[model samples]
Target: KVYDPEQRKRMITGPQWWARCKQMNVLDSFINYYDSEKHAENAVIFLHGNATSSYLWRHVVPHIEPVARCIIPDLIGMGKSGKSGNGSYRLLDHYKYLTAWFELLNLPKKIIFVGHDWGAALAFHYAYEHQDRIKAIVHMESVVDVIESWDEWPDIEEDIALIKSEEGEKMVLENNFFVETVLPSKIMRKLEPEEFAAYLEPFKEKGEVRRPTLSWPREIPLVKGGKPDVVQIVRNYNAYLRASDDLPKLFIESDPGFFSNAIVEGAKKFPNTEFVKVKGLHFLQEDAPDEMGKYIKSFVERVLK
Candidate 1:
């Protein structure tokens, strides 16, 4: 059954829109985003993880919009954004697009960012590079440690090998595993049929539109010698973590994966960081959006006050 926008009207509230960013010389390169208001001086930006788009925050956005302007964006290659590009969907490639988008918007001087999975990596990278632009950051299910070597990341070799293999391509492009298998496996609670369909709509197209999903796993900084640029970026951000004592940071995590001892210890060193453990799995929004939102809303309120 096709999704009629009005059928799930109450579930989806924000105004959906698109913005073209003239970055990387890609003419007509646009990003799809949802915003709660027309203008805002202090914005709460939610960045979703791999395979997911701004839709991931549907439940969380309403909670924050009441407190601050909520802006959620579907990264360049995902969601309803333009699929025409040869950028390979690498880490720096995404960073470039986001940098251009943010600059074009001329967002408020202070930004509160919420990131999950790969989104957390990009959020930290942006905050590290542009310390003054962001007022606070809320990150969950992210890569927090600086990788000195690939050995530190268990099964990385196998993961990377599969990513570069035919099997991986079959999963990502042919079968649409990210949304089909990976996403469902990560979430503890089962999603409603309509909700699942909404998440699956963007990638349901049967062509190069799925290339971005195929390219993301390869983009992970799983190896040291394999990707030198990702190595440097991670190190630079790690250094920022140690040095940025005054910037307020929040780390939200829940059982079984992603958060590590190294990250928890690192957060302790950051003079102005707080760690909150919520109840959920990798895709916490599906299971505990309200709890997640409450925690962030309280943090933003406390910090901005």
Candidate 2:
């Protein structure tokens, strides 16, 4: 059957779309935004990682809304955004959509970009290309740089391999593993069923709908690289992060999360980068929203002046 946006209309209407959001068209589908109604010369846009939507920023964006307009977009395939059919929801496809979406926004002159997981990687590529337009960059549990080694993330090596394996389909398509198990387990604190419902809601249906989640694990620039294009993306951004010392950066991590302690410590070599550690794990926004918001507020205030 041919793809139709109307068929997935229900997919784009979820808790993530509740408050104020506009469905702006991006290529084949529309990208939904958790938009704050505040006009300003500065804007802080948040991009959620793979398998999650802008809803991930639910608690934290409020703290910044007072200082600058906050805009959060659900990626092309995930969240309340329209699905990209025909197995077209890979990393490059996402980059193209983001590139187009940015053109459509006519964004503010000065911008702050925050990304989590793969979202962070996407921001790095965006920030690298749009460095002149960005004010500061912030990320947590981010893939802002290449892994270079599986030794960088030992704990989940097996899980990572599983996702890249033939069985990966069983997990993403049939089981919806990322949201069902990995997501809830990643957070140290227990997530309510309602939150789980919202997260899992997007992947509720079977088949191609879950391709984005499956694509994420495979796309991660692992040790030697099955996905060299993504490897190039991370490689480029890592260099950008190093050379752009004038750009204020806040690198948030967890005591025990997806990013290794070595990875956190080594990132310090990049000048102008500030590091903060939350008590919990990967999903710090869910675990330490107040602290995350406070840290971000202080970072932007210091740099924006």
Candidate 3:
């Protein structure tokens, strides 16, 4: 539970730290350390979803620090990390970033991945590629094989047509506002005023919201490549989703949306997995950090005890 306060400050405020390190490339990220006297058997590697950053894990990390080594990273183009700065940040791109991260840190030990939303995708890929290196996984709100069909969402078509039109560029730019609005709403049910303000602060100023917001819809394959691409990529990622099976996964469902429910059910595909229910809007950690942390501890103990 002991994090060097000085190191924490240098990480956030010091030059060449996370704020600037993120812009180094497509996979902008940083690590939060919890010093441990012994080698951590069940390390917590937390990944946040879109429109959110490692801050989502802030409330949850402290609770679990005593039991596990918690590592939090702000995925590129979000939070304190630099904006995309002209690069693709798609689902596949995330896997590439994970490889880069592994190269940077060379963390050769096993990890207990705690991922949410996009974090889930990244973790799934990382676990898929590095199965032998995983001890367990914890997740909330993920999409598992949701795109069984090649058909795109109805509204998505209208947006795509609008984008292919002459005004496409302007339209996409303007739509950034909509993305900004909805991004935080998906996770706001449990956030306090101050917490909410801090979450939005990075994007509110300096127009940081536009790039990350606009980046995904375009890079997400469906948004840019059309229905066929969406269908195919979904199929591809679903293949990755299937790769999560037979592993010890602790899936926490929040809001139980179509996609969230899909994630919970998806665990059935895995031989070694358990599902636990938790209360929250879309973001369980922020909405229920204490409970989430405690549940996480119990789940890890299942592997150890």
Candidate 4:
């Protein structure tokens, strides 16, 4: 269904919509703009977080595309991407998917990366491990550490109550809904109803993507015995975060909420990073597409150029 020819045409042309697709050979879906005469050896690649797909960039893409090419893929298990059957459905799973995307696309010349939430962590991982292939990094409201000690997190009274009253499990289970609704609800305040409607599309087909969504909360650290692998993933990615302290990074933040404060603290680890405050809850792009796009364009010029 994601690859239906007529539907795909409508999606690209702005009349229809689809989910994150997984097929690798279907690069055309991601490589949204192609100018044979102006082909770029290096292009921009975007990765969005949970409950979101490349569609997050629907508004941002056009601005940068005029000057550069773009490759936007919905991470596996979300968007229109394929999911693994009974496989690890977490951040590492996405790391592997991205590695394959690099190889499949022949590691397209010097990539400029834009990632949000999980994609932000994945972006730094890719850039750190393969800096030679990277052009620049732009990340919004994300954490490099997937499993953080409470020390790194601010004391939100409600969140504290959840952990203290042994309601942690409920917190975990409800994370998906929080992100699917609450976070967006907070971030999308300024967005026009029609504009924000597009951001809400992936969740429309809930059954198709619900498993991974349901699985991530259980997969986090201290959920059940701290999930050591989850802890290790955070530590490793944090190392990546530190490693790129000197790389040009545009750190986007908005609407101080569950993640905003924690994310800013983390961004301090990156030496060459800068911050831009956009209007968003967690899904900032949906609420302030024009502002986000402007930041992206300016960052590329100031940093990537």
Maximum-TM-score candidate: 2
On residues 18-68, what C-alpha lDDT tens digit does candidate 2 reach at each position? 556778888777788877857566778898887688877877887888887
Q: What is the lDDT of residue 188 in candidate 1?
A: 72
How accurate locally, in lDDT, is each candidate?
A: 0.72, 0.78, 0.58, 0.61
Output the number of the lDDT-best candidate: 2
Per-residue error (Å), model 4, residue 248: 1.1
| Cα shift from native, residue 103, model 4 (Å) | 1.7
Give lDDT tens digits, candidate 4, residues 128-230.
Answer: 6776777788888775554345654545435544543436434434434544545555553444443345545444553434555545544444433456876
What is the per-residue lDDT of model 3 for residues 1-305, given as tens digits with 9 covering 90 to 100? 22323333422322223332232343444333222223355567788876666766765766677776666766665666544434556666555655675555435377788888767767866776666888788877764444433342223456545555544445435444433444445553534344556456556654335455454445343424444544465556567556655567787767543246544555566556677776655666655677888888888777656
Q: Candidate 3's error at 241, in angstroms?
A: 5.2
| Clash pairs for candidate 3 | 246-271
Q: State every prediction's TM-score relative to the real structure.
A: 0.84, 0.91, 0.72, 0.74
Deviation in Å, model 4, residue 292 alpha carbon: 1.2
Question: If both were scored by TM-score, which would come out higher, candidate 1 or candidate 4?
Answer: 1
Task: Judge candidate 2 against the unseen true structure and give its global Cα lDDT, from 0 to 1.
Answer: 0.78
Residue pairs whose backbone atoms clash in candidate 1: none
Question: How well does candidate 3 score on lDDT at residue 184?
Answer: 49
